[PDB]
Amino acid sequence: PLPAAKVHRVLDAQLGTKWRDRFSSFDDKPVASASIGQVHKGIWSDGREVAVKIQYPGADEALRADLKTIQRLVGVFKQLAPGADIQGVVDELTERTEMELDYRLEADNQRAFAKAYRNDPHFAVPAIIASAPKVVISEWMEGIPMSVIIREGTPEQRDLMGTRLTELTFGAPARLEMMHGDAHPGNFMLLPDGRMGVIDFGAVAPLPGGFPTSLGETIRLARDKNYDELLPTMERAGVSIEEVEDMLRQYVDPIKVDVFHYNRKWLQKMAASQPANLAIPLRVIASTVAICCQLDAHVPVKVIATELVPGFA
Numbered sequence: 001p002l003p004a005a006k007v008h009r010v011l012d013a014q015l016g017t018k019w020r021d022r023f024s025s026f027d028d029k030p031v032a033s034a035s036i037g038q039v040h041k042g043i044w045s046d047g048r049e050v051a052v053k054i055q056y057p058g059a060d061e062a063l064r065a066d067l068k069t070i071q072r073l074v075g076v077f078k079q080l081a082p083g084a085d086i087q088g089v090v091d092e093l094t095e096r097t098e099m100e101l102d103y104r105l106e107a108d109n110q111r112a113f114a115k116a117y118r119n120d121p122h123f124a125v126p127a128i129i130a131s132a133p134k135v136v137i138s139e140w141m142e143g144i145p146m147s148v149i150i151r152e153g154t155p156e157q158r159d160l161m162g163t164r165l166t167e168l169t170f171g172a173p174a175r176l177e178m179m180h181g182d183a184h185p186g187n188f189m190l191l192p193d194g195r196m197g198v199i200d201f202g203a204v205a206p207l208p209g210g211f212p213t214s215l216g217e218t219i220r221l222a223r224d225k226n227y228d229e230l231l232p233t234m235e236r237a238g239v240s241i242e243e244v245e246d247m248l249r250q251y252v253d254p255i256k257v258d259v260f261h262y263n264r265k266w267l268q269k270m271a272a273s274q275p276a277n278l279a280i281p282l283r284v285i286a287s288t289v290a291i292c293c294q295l296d297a298h299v300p301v302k303v304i305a306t307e308l309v310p311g312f313a
């Protein structure tokens with residue numbers, strides 16, 4: 001944990017030496033760790049409870065040193081695997097590090113989601129109050145952490161958090177041509193009015209034009225065992241009949257029933273065996289399935305997909 005003197009020195013550099021005057025209250029004992037910082041709770045001068053996310057001063061050096069080590073270690077392998085896009089992975093980690101070290105980018109992403117979900121009946125996104133490279137101040141989100149609901153939730157709380165996460169994942173692309181790109185339970189909470197609180201916009205996925213109708217079509221045709229129209233749809237949108245059925249199961253099986261019971265045993269079943277356009281999106285969809293499985297959530301996936309997934313209806 002970054003000690004109080006150092007926390008204050010970051011805020012001095014980022015917000016000015018009179019930063020403490022912008023608050024009514026600021027608690028020096030952080031309430032949570034972040035990837036490369038820690039989160040404090042305070043109260044803004046206007047009485048709003050706030051989250052203050054503060055980057056560790058040594059984070060940039062530590063992440064950069066690690067990128068240089070990865071670059072040296074992979075250079076070794078490029079002479080063995082000259083086909084492997086190893087330089088592309090290191091370039092991607094470099095770009096993701098630059099993004100994470102500038103909390104203005106997460107704050108911009110959060111403002112876009114806050115506007116898209118303004119007055120949403122199902123989703124609460126905290127307003128950004130202040131943003132700087134190493135400090136983000138947003139509205140405190142009060143609710144039960146998804147991690148608590150996974151461990152000790154009522155069935156109703158579990159089902160609601162899976163249903164909300166499903167609606168966020170399927171719906172965000174039609175609403176603002178992006179996905180929330182990190183389905184980890186630390187990013188979510190259950191508000192007492194039934195909304196799901198959504199935080200951490202460091203990792204959004206752009207999806208301009210939204211999901212391609214080909215995604216919904218592909219699940220609709222696979223459910224319908226319409227293999228004559230499916231394989232041609234699946235080749236065009238980028239083969240045993242068993243193998244397709246197998247790779248589509250975690251997507252098809254839940255929309256064959258009005259209400260699917262996601263669970264860890266079923267996940268481990270669908271697993272076990274024997275195009276960057278959508279690549280990240282399909283990863284976030286699988287991440288949402290996995291979280292629904294840890295929640296043990298009963299989810300009406302069929303109606304949500306019918307309403308929000310192009311070509312499924």
Ligand SMILES: Nc1ncnc2c1ncn2[C@@H]1O[C@H](COP(=O)(O)OP(=O)(O)O)[C@@H](O)[C@H]1O
Nearest residue numbers: 032033034035039051126139140141186199200
């Ligand atoms: N607005 C907020 N309200 C309440 N808790 C928050 C808020 N922002 C962050 N937190 C807490 O701090 C943790 C870390 O913040 P997060 O934005 O997820 O950091 P990271 O950069 O690691 O993704 C969250 O998992 C949550 O426990």
Ligand SMILES: [Ca+2]
Nearest residue numbers: 184186187200
């Ligand atoms: Ca997070």
Ligand SMILES: [Ca+2]
Nearest residue numbers: 035200202203
């Ligand atoms: Ca993050």
